Design a protein around this ligand. Structure first.
Ligand SMILES: Cc1cc(C(=O)N[C@@H](Cc2ccc(F)cc2)C(=O)N[C@H](C=O)C[C@@H]2CCCNC2=O)no1
Length: 181
């Protein structure tokens, strides 16, 4: 229906496969030349995007007003290509959601929808030993190589995946303000 037809729309036009030195991830193109990666993909001065080498100009890693991790990294890629601006779909606030599907697209997991069902909010979350704020939780046994994958329910973009623990998965919650500048 609508909910996956929007996911497709997002698949074709905004979701790219990435490889950093840390592995496979799913990149979101937000607008123009701006993208988001999960902070632990750790993009350096360069990056693979569908196997072509892309140059990485800017790169910020987002934080709490308190200065905590949000495990998210805004990158500014180096092309005449323009990302179709999907910012209007990102909520004003980090919202929970009803029946979310997870759009993932890495070399290994192309065009993959994963039905995580409800996404609820969880907040502080100490995964690796690095803590993280403003995270949300779905009840789904999320696996490696999925990190960065997009969380969409009903035509909204509320999350980039980041952690898991074998039964649940956790996303980095988004709010529009992030992609202000
Ligand atoms: C047990 C245990 C699990 C994790 C864990 O989640 N680490 C994250 C990486 C991370 C490090 C620091 C940080 F601040 C935030 C995230 C991870 O590995 N993220 C993956 C994407 O690359 C996806 C995960 C992998 C685990 C299974 N489910 C998947 O969803 N740590 O200890």
């Amino acid at each position: 229906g609508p909910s996956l037809d929007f996911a497709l729309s997002l698949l074709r036009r905004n979701v790219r496969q990435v490889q950093t030195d840390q592995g496979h991830f799913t990149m979101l193109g937000v607008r123009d030349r701006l993208a988001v990666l999960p902070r632990h993909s750790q993009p350096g001065k360069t990056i693979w995007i569908e196997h072509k080498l892309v140059n990485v100009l800017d790169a910020v890693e987002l934080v709490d007003e308190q200065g905590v991790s949000l495990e998210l990294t805004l990158i500014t890629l180096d092309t005449n290509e323009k990302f179709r601006d999907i910012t209007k779909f990102i909520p004003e606030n980090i919202s929970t959601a009803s029946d979310a599907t997870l759009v993932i697209n890495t070399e290994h997991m192309p065009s993959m929808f994963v039905p995580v069902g409800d996404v609820v909010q969880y907040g502080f979350l100490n995964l690796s030993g690095k803590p993280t704020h403003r995270t949300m939780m779905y009840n789904f046994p999320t696996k490696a190589g999925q990190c960065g994958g997009v969380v969409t329910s009903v035509g909204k973009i509320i999350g980039i995946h980041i952690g898991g623990n074998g039964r649940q998965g956790f996303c980095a919650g988004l709010k529009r303000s992030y992609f202000a500048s």
